[PDB]
Design a binder for this molecule. Structure first.
Ligand SMILES: CN1c2c(nc(N)[nH]c2=O)NC[C@@H]1CNc1ccc(C(=O)N[C@@H](CCC(=O)O)C(=O)O)cc1
Ligand SMILES: CN1c2c(nc(N)[nH]c2=O)NC[C@@H]1CNc1ccc(C(=O)N[C@@H](CCC(=O)O)C(=O)O)cc1
Lengths: 281, 287, 277, 285
């Protein structure tokens, strides 16, 4: 009737040919986006190293590994890094970096694996747990909520948290959506991590379902061609009650705003909200 | 405005979430299949190693690397191996193996890179040449004829031949499509490169455009362990005919080479009784 | 990685249902345009009132649809010319006219296919109609993929250049000023019909309302539609320039005159205009 | 999640905007094509009218109505005609014609309704039967074999035969797919039902599933007056033997069945290879 016949199943690959969509105009521009932003801010390195060291943390778990940029740093600082991610296409880059530098004893002890928050417990042979777990770069917002009850989110944090050893730390952040939703416009290049050395026109698209923010989409453009990403607009208010219950209350919360601590009714409006937690009980 | 709107563009990934279609049912079963092909027959190893010694081939370029099964073997047998593929999804498994065995010196000198046949001259640094170039497992057939004049085929073969240094060897194969086209069905699961431990049922679809074969599509129905469970996936191939391919691979060297064809590791005499499942063309480059 | 179709998009063939003609979504949608083909006496009264007290007789419906609004004006001896861009909507108007072809009135009912964007060439007028109606919030159905409302200006410029001088134009649109604000579009407001679970989805691009989508439900199946959220403020300056200023613009709100800073918040804003010059 | 957000559900329309894909390039060229087929040959009219008189057939049911070309003819020639199709997009043109000529009494008594072969027993009120039932223009081939066992084909034929009253006539055809399958190409544009005033190039694609023909796809490249654009359609390639067997079985083997090869009787093995095969079946009772 009106069905469509595909040469190969979706998700399937074959020796000799590029995988599906591997080199469209959108993936190509996107490649440059994850490359022309694989640089870090001294302010960032300072803060991150600061927090981690002054906690006795050494065995760190990055659950938003990505191209490994944040882990490659902790690896150069002698930390015991375990980089993990659900995206094999993002991971390709972390691994490629580790192999190029396999001669450096540090990069030889760098564990890079594939894991999914939704099943992190079984995907990652932890056991002893880690001193610190990091999920920075606004990566958690990448996880949508197609279920409709944030349940998907609770499982993700419940799992991410049950990966930290008692008395352990958890640095999980997310952009400031309370502000983006309000202003409808999300500043382009207004980061605090990567030094934007690329041209980027960002078109913010918020979708409100029954008056409730449901999603934020960004269309990055450069010259003629563009690509897009979507995030779940998390409210600093709602994220907090959410990240804490993932621990079961047994946590010593604290929230920064672009590395500086945060006080409600504050004067400076943060670009990113970083939530740090010590797994008390 | 009738046009679907994307959460994220096609071919873009994001930390925290699985890539585009990696967790689908077809991808899942397809993964059980490429992990089953990971096991070659004793006859095959003997033939390939036999063939590569008989010419002193030391440096080998595997241009259809895949999960690295054949490459992993030549690496263990002392060869200088550089593997290459256009598919990151499959190359991922090769890299993973080379990493686990990074402590074995032979594996630390095993080069694995991404490269596409159509742009092989630029994707891989040679200039000199390779003792032997292999493209086995019926991989070349994955390349379709989009334009209709097999120009991509000639360009891919040309770039592939280019990698063979003078006096070099090129071993490339394809399934017997002369037989598949004639009977419309693909031989009774009997494979000679690998032992298929997994159970499968194969539906063959041939498409003919203006009476000229243009494509063969195989739908594999696998009995997944669990669920006696039945799920499936599909793959397509350009049905290369022995005559057509012999003509094409020679033309890639400029007709400047010695060319002989095997029928399942044994020499093939036109008209022979035994109908081969695969045809292996072995070409020695004049100079 | 191409996909292959047995037949092109838009093509039909003798013997088989057209593409998507009977999915679970179209089926529910059929009931939606059927379980709402009824009218409100308040509506009939207001519409007949306005039209008659203007000497209007030759009326042009540019949002014909299933013909429900025209079938009314036809039963009231008006000279009706029902037009629409949707052949699938029209199928219903025509089907009604043929069933009632014996009634001299329904035999003089002209039902054609026309597109606002090309109304000038699609509809042979020359003279101009006494009245033109585009009710039911139909104009909001036209999106703005162009990005500069230009598509909208052409639609009105054409819809207007279809009215004879001294002629009337009744074009309405739901109250989006309110929907955007409350995020929830009033579900089931008896002002046009008397028929569902509506899920409003607003999309703001760079802080600018860009679209409103409604997901209608029935129990285990649903369908959806999208509209351009027009602001009573922006629509006005828009509908007037389509005439070139030469018009006595007036705005109602649920069949009654509207006054800014009013107390009652309208469900629909009806814009009436007399083509002065 | 990698799902896509629709502006409107598939198959839903909205006043003011063109339906789903009505204004595309393929639809546009496809429209030039169905408006070109609107013109039958003198040989065809003579044969069909000949055939329908030779049996006294008065009430005729056209089960593959389309734009109503054949129906419009039988209406002019005095028959009692009820046309029917599953495609509203095509039925639109038939209705439009009947409306323009509503003043001609023959056209006011011309019934046109939507009905699907698979549900013909319920879609059309008969119970009694029709003198003759026609399904020409190689329309039955539009019905694909989704399930793989031709069950839909048997169900559609059965419902179609049902409409033929005892002593009735059923005229149904299909192109010569025995020839198309063998040579992989569709005959040199020579058509016998209609005069093709429009220029066309046809690429034929045959798909064989397990060595059994399953589909024929035609890509028509039309030389549009002005400015070369194209559209595609697919068909189930019915073989004469298979179809003869199927149409008889639809009557329960209770009927007389003869096949024509382009309006002329077909003797197996004849020299002239027909473009179309017309099966004419008289229903025993
Ligand atoms: C749609 N099809 C179909 C089905 N069965 C089911 N259940 N559903 C279907 O949709 N049976 C097979 C049939 C196959 N149809 C087609 C139509 C066109 C092409 C085609 O054009 N194929 C060429 C490429 C042409 C080009 O790239 O321009 C090919 O290599 O597949 C293939 C198969
Ligand atoms: C994908 N989505 C989704 C879901 N729920 C489920 N189950 N599955 C899904 O895929 N919830 C709604 C969400 C909607 N996402 C989006 C993303 C982008 C646009 C968008 O760009 N919309 C504009 C047009 C923009 C343009 O044309 O450039 C629009 O008018 O819809 C809309 C909705």
């Amino acid at each position: 009737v009106d069905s469509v016949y595909r040469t190969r199943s979706l998700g399937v690959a074959a020796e000799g040919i590029p995988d599906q969509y591997a080199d469209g105009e959108a993936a190509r521009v996107w490649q440059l986006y994850i490359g022309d932003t694989r640089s870090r801010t001294a302010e960032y390195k300072a803060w991150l190293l600061g927090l981690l060291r002054q906690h006795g943390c050494h065995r760190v778990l990055d659950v938003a590994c990505g191209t490994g940029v944040d882990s490659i740093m902790l690896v150069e600082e002698g930390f015991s890094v375990t980089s993990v991610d659900a995206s094999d296409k993002m991971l390709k880059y972390a691994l490629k970096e580790r192999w190029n530098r396999r001669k450096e004893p540090a990069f030889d002890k760098w564990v890079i694996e594939e894991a999914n928050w939704l099943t992190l417990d079984k995907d990652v042979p932890a056991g002893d747990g880690f001193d610190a777990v990091i999920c920075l770069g606004n990566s958690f917002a990448h996880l949508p909520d197609s279920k409709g009850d944030q349940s998907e989110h609770r499982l993700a944090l419940k799992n991410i948290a049950s990966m930290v050893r008692p008395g352990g730390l958890l640095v999980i952040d997310h952009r400031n959506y309370d502000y983006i939703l309000s202003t409808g416009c999300a500043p382009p290049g207004k980061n605090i991590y990567y030094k934007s050395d690329l041209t980027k026109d960002i078109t913010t698209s918020v979708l409100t379902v029954n008056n409730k923010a449901h999603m934020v989409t960004l269309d990055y453009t450069v010259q003629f061609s563009k690509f897009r990403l979507s995030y779940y607009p998390h409210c600093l208010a709602s994220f907090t009650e959410l990240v804490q219950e993932a621990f079961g209350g047994r946590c010593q919360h604290s929230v920064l705003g672009d590395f500086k601590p945060y006080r409600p009714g504050q004067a400076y409006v943060p670009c990113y909200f970083i939530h740090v937690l010590k797994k008390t009980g």
